[PDB]
Amino acid sequence: EGKLTVERDMIKTETPAFSPILEFEQDPAQILDALLPLYLNSQILRALQESL
Amino acid sequence: PLIAAASVIAAGLAVGLASIGPGVGQGTAAGQAVEGIARQPEAEGKIRGTLLLSLAFMEALTIYGLVVALALLFANPFV
């Protein structure tokens, strides 16, 4: 209209099961221990910018 | 005879103690080969080609051990 609204679609993306042949140089009980700080930072930045 | 009996004992020992070596290495190789083919069945053709190329040189040592056992059984030029 003459005014604005919000457009939010729950955008999904695939589970690629990325590769069976991809090798874990850091022992996938160990790489997740550092991957999870990244999930924390991404969630906190998405919340920060959603608040803004 | 006696020296021929010792050659027969050597024929036992040679082919007996030979077959364990490739008989463990080729097994470890086969386990890791099927693990590789399971993590990737895409390159399976060249995988099995390399598998045969390794398996021939694997079994050749046990073949030569059985050959030395037969060469002490019958074709013993020292006894």
Side-chain angles (χ1 to χ4, degrees), chain A residues 1-11 14-24 26-52, chain B residues 1 4-6 10-12 14 16 18 21-23 25 27 29-31 33 36 38 41 43-46 48-49 56 60 65 69 71 75 77:
Chain A
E1 305 87 349
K3 67 189 196 70
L4 307 165
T5 63
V6 181
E7 186 42 77
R8 41 190 302 278
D9 44 350
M10 181 180 172
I11 288 166
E14 81 275 2
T15 302
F18 205 78
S19 151
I21 205 65
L22 78 88
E23 304 295 318
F24 303 105
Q26 282 78 240
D27 298 330
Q30 196 40 63
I31 183 171
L32 267 300
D33 315 341
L35 189 136
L36 263 290
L38 178 133
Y39 190 31
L40 203 155
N41 192 12
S42 175
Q43 287 309 114
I44 204 160
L45 198 47
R46 201 144 170 108
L48 257 176
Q49 305 319 302
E50 185 139 18
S51 92
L52 278 168
Chain B
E44 187 264 1
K46 307 180 294 169
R48 284 198 90 169

